[PDB]
């Protein structure tokens, strides 16, 4: 079982403070983008569904990074899915 929820993160000039894995055409085929590390609300294993207005379904890891780079500085609304 899994919950979808909405959280707010701060976009700083470097990024959002986490690394993603998975995505389209990743290791085990097409998988969701999930957080695998917080560089120090979100936690490891969270699946990213939407970053601001951009849906993450079907994106590669690199495409997702370009989505993060384009985000204006300040608060950013993000939709995630989290297990149990």
């Amino acid at each position: 079982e899994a919950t979808v929820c909405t959280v707010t993160l701060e976009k700083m000039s470097a990024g959002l403070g986490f690394s993603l894995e998975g995505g389209k055409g990743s290791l085990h085929g097409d998988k969701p983008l999930t957080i695998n590390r917080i560089f120090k609300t979100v936690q490891p294993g969270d699946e990213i569904l939407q970053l601001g207005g951009t849906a993450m379904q079907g994106l590669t890891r690199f495409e997702a990074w370009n989505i993060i780079k384009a985000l204006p500085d300040g608060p950013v609304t993000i939709v995630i899915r989290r297990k149990s």
Partner: antibody
Amino acid sequence: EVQLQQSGPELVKPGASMKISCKASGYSFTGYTMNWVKQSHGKNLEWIGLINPYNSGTNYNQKFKDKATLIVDKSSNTAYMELLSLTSEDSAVYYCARSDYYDSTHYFDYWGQGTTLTVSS
Amino acid sequence: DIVLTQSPASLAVSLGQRATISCRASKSVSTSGYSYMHWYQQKPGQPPKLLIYLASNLESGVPARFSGSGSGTDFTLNIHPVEEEDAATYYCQHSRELPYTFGGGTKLEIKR
């Protein structure tokens, strides 16, 4: 899980060129940047450059701009570094190492086993 | 280019004691809430192994006796309590800006 397997040691004549390969397994090759590092007995550890296999975009250390060329092959999950007009100064152990460009963090969390190059006649 | 200077060049430390290694950068490697400074361990015949990333974070699988701290231009790697297998050369590396560079290394001898 993650493995970076480099090609074998090589003896090469001055003025020639040579290619070192780094075959990646256990992760998404086109998801992470590949770095190359030189370890010698003169300057010890030096960063040469990196390449993003997704689009072959690269950044070089300027000291190596005329010495090294980076390419990738997506179909074989392999990164290559070509070293040009070799001198004995190029004799060293070379490493490939994975980094993450997310938040521009670029630490080198996985390394190849190293490739020993000797330039000599 | 940023120059990293490690101190000391070598040190010896008894089992169970504390090893302290410092790295000094020629200019700041902190920005946007990060310190782009990382630590590696290297034993002969092997590539460097990542110990600490972004100044103070423990790489997964690295024993808790390793820690790092600092910001700006001054960083320190600490090992406590030191064990036999920590005999190695330790390196710092920045990723603040191009080109990435490494310190000169510090060799750690275990006394017995």
